[PDB]
Amino acid sequence: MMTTIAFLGLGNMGAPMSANLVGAGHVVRGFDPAPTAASGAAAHGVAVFRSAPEAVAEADVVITMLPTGEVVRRCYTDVLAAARPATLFIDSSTISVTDAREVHALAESHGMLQLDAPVSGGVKGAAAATLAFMVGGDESTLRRARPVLEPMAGKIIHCGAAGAGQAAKVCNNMVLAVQQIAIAEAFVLAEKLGLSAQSLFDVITGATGNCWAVHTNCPVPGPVPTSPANNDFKPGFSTALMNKDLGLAMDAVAATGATAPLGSHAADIYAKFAADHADLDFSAVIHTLRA
Amino acid sequence: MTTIAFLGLGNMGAPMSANLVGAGHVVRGFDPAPTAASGAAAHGVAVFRSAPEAVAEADVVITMLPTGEVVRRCYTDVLAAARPATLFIDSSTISVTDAREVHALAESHGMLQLDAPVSGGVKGAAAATLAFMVGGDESTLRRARPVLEPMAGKIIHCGAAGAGQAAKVCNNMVLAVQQIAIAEAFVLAEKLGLSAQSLFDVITGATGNCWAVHTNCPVPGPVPTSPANNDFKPGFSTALMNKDLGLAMDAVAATGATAPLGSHAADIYAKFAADHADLDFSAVIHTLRA
Numbered sequence: 001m002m003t004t005i006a007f008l009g010l011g012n013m014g015a016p017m018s019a020n021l022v023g024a025g026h027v028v029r030g031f032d033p034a035p036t037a038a039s040g041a042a043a044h045g046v047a048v049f050r051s052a053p054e055a056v057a058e059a060d061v062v063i064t065m066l067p068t069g070e071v072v073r074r075c076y077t078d079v080l081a082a083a084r085p086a087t088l089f090i091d092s093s094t095i096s097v098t099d100a101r102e103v104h105a106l107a108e109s110h111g112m113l114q115l116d117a118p119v120s121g122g123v124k125g126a127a128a129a130t131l132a133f134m135v136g137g138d139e140s141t142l143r144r145a146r147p148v149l150e151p152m153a154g155k156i157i158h159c160g161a162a163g164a165g166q167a168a169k170v171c172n173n174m175v176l177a178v179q180q181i182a183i184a185e186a187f188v189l190a191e192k193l194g195l196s197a198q199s200l201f202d203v204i205t206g207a208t209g210n211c212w213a214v215h216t217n218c219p220v221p222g223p224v225p226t227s228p229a230n231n232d233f234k235p236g237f238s239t240a241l242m243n244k245d246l247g248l249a250m251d252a253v254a255a256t257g258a259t260a261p262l263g264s265h266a267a268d269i270y271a272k273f274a275a276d277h278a279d280l281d282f283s284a285v286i287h288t289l290r291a
Numbered sequence: 292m293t294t295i296a297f298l299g300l301g302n303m304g305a306p307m308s309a310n311l312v313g314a315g316h317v318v319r320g321f322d323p324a325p326t327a328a329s330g331a332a333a334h335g336v337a338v339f340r341s342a343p344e345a346v347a348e349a350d351v352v353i354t355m356l357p358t359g360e361v362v363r364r365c366y367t368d369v370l371a372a373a374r375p376a377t378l379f380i381d382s383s384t385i386s387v388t389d390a391r392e393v394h395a396l397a398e399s400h401g402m403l404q405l406d407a408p409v410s411g412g413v414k415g416a417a418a419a420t421l422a423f424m425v426g427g428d429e430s431t432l433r434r435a436r437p438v439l440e441p442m443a444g445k446i447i448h449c450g451a452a453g454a455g456q457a458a459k460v461c462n463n464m465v466l467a468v469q470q471i472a473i474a475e476a477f478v479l480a481e482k483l484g485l486s487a488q489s490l491f492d493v494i495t496g497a498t499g500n501c502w503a504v505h506t507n508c509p510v511p512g513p514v515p516t517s518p519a520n521n522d523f524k525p526g527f528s529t530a531l532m533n534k535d536l537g538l539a540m541d542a543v544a545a546t547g548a549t550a551p552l553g554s555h556a557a558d559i560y561a562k563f564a565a566d567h568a569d570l571d572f573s574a575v576i577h578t579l580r581a
């Protein structure tokens with residue numbers, strides 16, 4: 001149903017997400033403290049406001065799409081008292097599980113409904129409205145939120161209680177990072193063995209080793225012409241963002257006392273690579289295994 | 292139609308040879324274990340006291356043996372007994388270096404030779420669904436194809452000699468890494484209060500998906516048939532995975548390659564095989580706190 005939505009954070013993800021909500025007939029009230037972000041969002045039909053409290057004042061739903069837990073926490077502290085009681089808050093930022101539960105609790109103590117709904121699919125998913133939302137919180141609250149999320153989404157998955165969205169995401173992305181390094185390692189070893197890249201591709205993809213890091217993101221040019229390796233390692237999914245998600249994985253590991261040997265090794269590998277190659281697709285880590 | 296000498300009639304070699312008999316081949320056999328040889332003779336293999344005798348009348352000689360050293364020693368023991376242009380197929384899993392050496396040895400005797408290691412285990416072997424990954428010439432593979440077919444679900448030409456070994460060892464190194472990574476994720480999810488079923492639904496629907504989770508799920512429930520629901524009965528044993536990883540490490544050393552994650556997995560599984568060699572390799576989920 002047609003709803004008034006405050007959208008806080010109108011950057012690379014926020015702006016195309018808000019555009020799709022405008023497209024779907026929603027009244028969208030935006031705030032972003034970077035005026036260039038606000039401007040682009042305004043051009044696609046977002047009513048932009050001077051302050052986050054103002055955007056929130058007349059909203060049935062408040063979406064945050066923000067860079068860090070700290071920024072989300074700060075935003076919530078600024079805006080929750082300005083919101084009408086029992087407003088629905090959706091945080092679609094990617095933040096630590098700890099941060100997520102903290103801000104969830106904060107929202108509920110102000111009388112607001114709240115979900116964590118971080119997304120995968122990147123800017124291209126965002127623009128095409130094919131993002132996967134991975135949701136933590138009450139089933140009934142998600143029920144309410146569904147018609148707001150659908151115009152932005154390819155998939156909506158209920159993961160469990162508050163924080164389970166962030167948890168599911170960060171677990172997947174840790175696995176992914178490990179797979180991307182492992183695939184790169186196999187391709188270089190193959191090369192040193194005289195096994196052709198095409199041959200190795202055909203085998204792994206036909207065998208138990210198959211995974212998106214090879215079938216879609218193949219780190220050598222040729223076998224999958226759409227993969228970033230064929231395009232100077234243009235993201236795609238940048239090393240900067242993978243390194244962020246791995247930091248959040250390591251936060252979760254630290255918070256739980258879990259043991260994740262390879263997840264953590266992959267974290268240290270991507271952190272070193274991020275220093276000088278933050279801008280390249282995460283499949284570019286193959287470069288560290290050659291010469 | 293064809294006479295085949297089958298050298299190595301063990302857990303894999305016995306059922307593979309039974310399938311060859313089943314497809315109308317004359318199978319001649321050798322194994323140093325009487326129990327293996329006897330079982331094989333029970334399903335139609337003519338068992339001989341030595342490998343050179345088994346080889347004498349054969350058009351094709353298949354090896355299924357435990358190490359490159361044994362394969363090399365077999366070749367040097369039988370090559371003079373073979374007729375010229377006999378087709379040698381090594382379906383042992385040995386190092387790429389060993390494969391190429393024995394390939395060159397065989398061809399120097401005017402024989403034709405392939406490396407064709409297999410995936411699928413005893414189960415696959417008995418069911419005739421093994422995946423053969425082949426190195427050697429395409430024309431030689433073509434000539435071999437009617438022998439491989441009755442043992443095989445899948446036959447892939449990987450490249451020149453050694454490429455079959457190479458492809459297998461590279462896939463299994465990745466598999467080992469995946470199996471550990473998936474296990475990490477399940478125990479992480481559990482400590483975060485994320486249910487095993489929710490994690491499973493997400494990963495299988497997302498970029499992290501792989502066989503290690505969709506078929507070998509290391510926690511019981513999401514995949515009722517996975518070894519986790521059956522006391523981690525193999526499946527694919529830790530002993531065997533540890534074997535393949537040893538071979539990956541030889542290949543890494545031999546080439547001077549950088550394989551930090553593959554190597555780390557190799558370390559983990561080598562440790563784990565000291566205590567739980569007989570369990571499915573997905574059981575590694577319960578050795579993360581070591």
Ligand SMILES: NC(=O)c1ccc[n+]([C@@H]2O[C@H](COP(=O)([O-])OP(=O)(O)OC[C@H]3O[C@@H](n4cnc5c(N)ncnc54)[C@H](O)[C@@H]3O)[C@@H](O)[C@H]2O)c1
Nearest residue numbers: 008009011012013014032034037066067075093094122123
């Ligand atoms: N490929 C991707 O871009 C991708 C994919 C999935 C998830 N994510 C995650 O999405 C989140 C944001 O993505 P993005 O690309 O839009 O980030 P971005 O950094 O491009 O934009 C963040 C925006 O938030 C604004 N902001 C900061 N403080 C604010 C406040 N108090 N109120 C309102 N706005 C504020 C900033 O000015 C900026 O425009 C991150 O948590 C990121 O890790 C990104």
Ligand SMILES: C[C@@H](CCC(=O)O)C(=O)O
Nearest residue numbers: 150151152153154155156
């Ligand atoms: C993703 C959502 C439908 C919305 C859409 O396709 O934009 C659903 O299937 O739950």
Ligand SMILES: C[C@@H](CCC(=O)O)C(=O)O
Nearest residue numbers: 440441442443444445446
């Ligand atoms: C030719 C066939 C193998 C025959 C078999 O199924 O046993 C295949 O390549 O799949």
